[PDB]
Amino acid sequence: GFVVALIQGDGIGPEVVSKSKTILARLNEKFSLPIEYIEVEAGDTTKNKFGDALPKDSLRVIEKADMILKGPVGETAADVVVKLRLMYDLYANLRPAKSLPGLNKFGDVDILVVRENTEDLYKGLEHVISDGVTVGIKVITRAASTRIAQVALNQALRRKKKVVCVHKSNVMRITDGLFAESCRNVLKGKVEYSEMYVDAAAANLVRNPQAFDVIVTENTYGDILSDEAGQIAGSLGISPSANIGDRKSLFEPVHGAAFDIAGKNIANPTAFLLSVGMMLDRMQELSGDIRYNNAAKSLRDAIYSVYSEGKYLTPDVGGSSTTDEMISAIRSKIG
Amino acid sequence: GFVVALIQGDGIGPEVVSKSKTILARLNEKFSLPIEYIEVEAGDTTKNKFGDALPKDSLRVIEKADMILKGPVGETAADVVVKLRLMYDLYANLRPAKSLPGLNKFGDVDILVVRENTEDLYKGLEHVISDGVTVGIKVITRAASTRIAQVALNQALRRKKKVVCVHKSNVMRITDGLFAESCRNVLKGKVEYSEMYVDAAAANLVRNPQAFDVIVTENTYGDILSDEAGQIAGSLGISPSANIGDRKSLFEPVHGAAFDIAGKNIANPTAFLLSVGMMLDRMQELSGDIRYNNAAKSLRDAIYSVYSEGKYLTPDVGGSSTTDEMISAIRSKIG
Amino acid sequence: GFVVALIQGDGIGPEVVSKSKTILARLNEKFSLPIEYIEVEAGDTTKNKFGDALPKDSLRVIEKADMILKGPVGETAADVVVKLRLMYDLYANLRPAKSLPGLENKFGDVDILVVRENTEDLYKGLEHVISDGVTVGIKVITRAASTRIAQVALNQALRRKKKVVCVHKSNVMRITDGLFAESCRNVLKGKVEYSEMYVDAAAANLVRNPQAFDVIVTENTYGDILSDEAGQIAGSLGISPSANIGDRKSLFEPVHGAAFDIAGKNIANPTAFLLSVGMMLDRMQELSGDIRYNNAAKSLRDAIYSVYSEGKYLTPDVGGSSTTDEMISAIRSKIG
């Protein structure tokens, strides 16, 4: 079985996670899933109580858990999710941007961004050098570039066998140059391979998103391209994520805390529920138990039906229903 | 009068610049413009002849000139345009993304990106630290952040008095934090002001580009957002640029060398010609002579008519005509 | 008036500081000095009792104070001294290396002043692990800082033998050390007898002929090393003061450590602390403009030299058989 650290987060995190809990419990029962969810404290409110956004007590629980499942965190998000990615070396950030039926703005969209998740500018090596002068250290390593490119190969083998490596090695000759070279060395000759500058990737996503299968890129570039790709697919409200390392993993929506709609019962739970889908997939592949696959298919079929029918969709995906209405619709289709 | 260093560049640069020359000469004559164009050597081919992509001889001419007007450069572009931005402190990169009539994909679009053009990761402070380990120094300074925010204020005063500062200060607390703080200090209270993380900017550009007036941001973020905004407006083939410093300025398309269509007479000259339009505007504001304004209006009216009529457009903007056909159409409407 | 945070510190720190108070009081009495000494806690003992080497209340008093006067700190010395240097931009570290009369010493009488940039170089702790087994540190050299320290070197040299050597390694560090050297040049050339020396050559040349040097101006790390070398050469390391001068704040301390070995035996030599009180009084003249701090510093320094010159009431480390207390009385008697 699995122990899952469940972090609710801030803004819409609590309402989306707590309402979605009814579906997690229904899957546990219907498919006899040996998964224990333990709620753990992290984020902006947590920082007010403990003085730390990610306190020792929470770390103690997470260290014990197998996996982390979380809603968005607010202003302290770097002290929560970035700290976790670093400390557990959750080096592969997998973000599928996939259209659901009965949405546009771009028709059929299915793009996977594979984002390097541990280096680049994300380790906080920043300093005030002098009055009004600041510096940050960007870090690119062969080790980290090679392993992310390996993840991109594995993913692309399961899709259309096509990968574009996105970087800016024309300007960043040494750092991005090493990244591209490492990617080239793992990928070229095993999949259809190409390279594209990040600025031209941003434009090409808009011009022709159906030209893209797998995108492999660095931390900050992946942050940016995954948001763009997510919106293109139709909404950040439908965009899930897996942060996968060697020993642990973390599952979460791409979207933020959305403080301006918090408490209003219109947040889309789909990104979170799809992240649960990716969690269950991995539970299957680790356990060798088909029940997690059955629960994953029930979940996804349910969401896909709700979208296909199109009566209980939140405003962000073109509907007029509440988070509650959406959750009940999905729940009744399970399972 | 003005002396203009004219750099043709690589890929489609030569054909677009040399064909456009007929319009530059026609404006000089029709409006009695005292502008001398001097052709100077820069880029990939230039590097083969001299050993330097931007040789001393070219620098000698540029130092003498008032302004630089250029086509795209290929693989050595960082040794050409980045070297020029740095050495002349051309600190404001102004990129208007504006729809022309009779294009979509997004209807009416009019967004100005104001991109800081001298620091961030663009100064090439990169090193191999150790076997397989590389580092780059990102630089953000108050001085540079303040002056770009001043340019964004001036531009926004001429438009809808609305500015969004785009950064990633949730993760880059010190560098991006200083950037945002400097922007806040110049802008807030003088224009409608807000702040947005770069990832959410990328998504919001797609979701609702008409919500944006002026975007002020750092070097790399601006590189990325200006390409996305340009495509949204309809094509990188229509996206001009001004690089403005205290003593000199440089005008150029946002797009690259486009080697795969070089020599095929289908490149869109509009981005370059619109960059000439921005050059002439500035000549007016420096000289106090209305003739440059008359030439600028003739040029823009001509291009706008060609687009509005819609018979002589290149493939990138939905037509089927050649670069030649487009140039002759614009030329005959001048002036 | 001035307020002075008086830090007793660790090891011999408390005995030296507290036994010297009677000299502080004498000076205030004889020269009508409006100085208030407020006791502030810092160091290893403070950390054990309060949980911090510099607890909140200590920082509170330090803020209000104009100057800090301290004894040695133990294992938390870096935590205390460095934080204070950076917090209050105490940019000039003044390290005199001067023989006293007539002490046994291998090199004869040496008189050298190291002027050490005290806020940048590698002391800002801008360090990280960037990868498994790879660390990096950021050395910072600025024009403003290098210019400031050279101006200080100018004033000290003019007061001495008009001779400054700028010490660096700009043959290898072309940009950082090159900016330091250039800033020293621009301040010093044409106003003093100026020269430059590579740091490795300086270390050899101090040994070879220490009598050739007057003032050395250099960076944070090079200065840490050359101060101690010059100090040992002069035979004065256990005896010599130091000053860390900032615009709004200054810190004065002996260069010697806590010497836990001899704590409690009533023999610690108070000379270094007392000369650092001498440097404090010099800085009080400058900020206040008044002559009484000068007369006081000269009285103090005269008294000290005379007890070393007569030989009858010295502690054992400088060739005597008296207690700290007996040495202090003798010094105290010669004041006013």
Next chain:
Amino acid sequence: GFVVALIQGDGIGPEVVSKSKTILARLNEKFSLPIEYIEVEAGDTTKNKFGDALPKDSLRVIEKADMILKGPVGETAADVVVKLRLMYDLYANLRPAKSLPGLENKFGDVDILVVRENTEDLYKGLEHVISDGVTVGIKVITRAASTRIAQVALNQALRRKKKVVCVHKSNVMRITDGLFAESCRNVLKGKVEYSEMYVDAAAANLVRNPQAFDVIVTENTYGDILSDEAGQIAGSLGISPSANIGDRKSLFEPVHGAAFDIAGKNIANPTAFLLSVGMMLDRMQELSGDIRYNNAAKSLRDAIYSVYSEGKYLTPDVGGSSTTDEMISAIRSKIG
């Protein structure tokens, strides 16, 4: 067999190197050493004639060579020596500071070896202007490099008095200097008599009691400074050799400069160059496995010590009245 790029250099470099060739030949003859010496150009004179301090042809020969044997270089010393160090990862800098018989010297007989990490710290020149008046440099400390240098310190100490001091400033540079010290610990503890000393305390303690030290292991900058200090203390700076050891390549040179002052007068002391030939022969034993390089190095070193011991044919800098040429003949006669 070995190929040695023989660099004559500048100032006294050419006279010392070329007059020593007859000793190179003697050694090859007497001990059947398959060594080929190929003359390679580098330095100030080379730059003036060819446009580069290390021209293409020089780099071509250096590549093919197993070892570099050089005299001093002038103003281009950093351009030459540093490039070579980084290019060929000559990671161990061996700097002996040893008195010779029986030279006048202030501190008596000293025998100290500095083992200096020779490829990282601040010597990679990772420096820039980041803003008007603000420069930055990147100090790099790696586990691999620090471990390598400690292993070298182990072998040298075992050959000597089994005593190593690791010198650093980890109280201030907690991460870079902390990794260096930790790597030295992990190699050395339990195999030698190990201790650590702060770099400023080391500079003072070398002066105070140089007889206490056997081997010092430290970083690139600290080593540059302490080598020269220790060298002056021993009275051996003009006399002492150095080695820069890499896996595929090694460089041997005197520590003394070009001494343009005395070039052409037939008096330059060839001892430093000749002992660096001694260190070259030690390294040739290790790579080849054969004993003849050892017998040769001992013959050389015996010959040198004996001419210093008899006093009749020494150059003027070490208290004699002979020419370089006369000193070389005397040395040459005692070989084989």
